[PDB]
């Protein structure tokens, strides 16, 4: 069992429902996973770059928050 498959149909189905979606094609599950992988790669890459620069080995909430902000995806509620 590959990690990305830990993001299961049921979880993907719940996200869509909160998104007001009514009926889901079967191919949607793999596509959503690719999309999440890309989103997470873009953000983690920036978080880890802030970590290394600070010479730490622990990615912190702030590193994630500054990474999200850099990408135009500002998040409130975790510092900064």
């Amino acid at each position: 069992r590959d990690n990305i498959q830990g993001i299961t149909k049921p979880a993907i189905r719940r996200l869509a429902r909160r998104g007001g979606v009514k009926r889901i094609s079967g191919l949607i599950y793999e596509e959503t996973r690719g999309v999440l992988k890309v989103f997470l790669e873009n953000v983690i890459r920036d978080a880890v770059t802030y970590t290394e620069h600070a010479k730490r080995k622990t990615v912190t909430a702030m590193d994630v928050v500054y990474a999200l902000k850099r990408q135009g995806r500002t998040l409130y509620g975790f510092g900064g």
């Binding site: 500002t74 998040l75 409130y76 509620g77 975790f78 510092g79 900064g80």
Partner: protein, 95 residues
């Protein structure tokens, strides 16, 4: 243990004048603090860009004011400016 400044107690005071009998959860306060830090940053940033465009070195209330007109949507800006002129006045006239 080094001090982390926060806007929490001032957010709580403003809360009390607004809904004297209402509270605010921890996670909600964290959000408000992020909101206040974010808005101050966008404002000081525009205001110093304004200063630089005009070959000036001082950030005066006039830059803060144009920055508010550039950052806030119509009504919000109308009142905000109004709140700003009003604090400066009351402060200019004092001892």
């Amino acid at each position: 243990k080094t001090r982390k400044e926060s806007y929490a107690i001032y957010v709580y005071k403003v809360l009390k004048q607004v809904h004297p009998d209402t509270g605010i959860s921890s996670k909600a306060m964290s959000i408000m603090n992020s909101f206040v830090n974010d808005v101050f940053e966008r404002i000081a940033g525009e205001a110093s860009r304004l200063a630089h465009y005009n070959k000036r070195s001082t950030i005066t209330s006039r830059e803060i004011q144009t920055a508010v007109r550039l950052l806030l949507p119509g009504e919000l800006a109308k009142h905000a400016v109004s709140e700003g002129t009003k604090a400066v006045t009351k402060y200019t006239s004092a001892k």
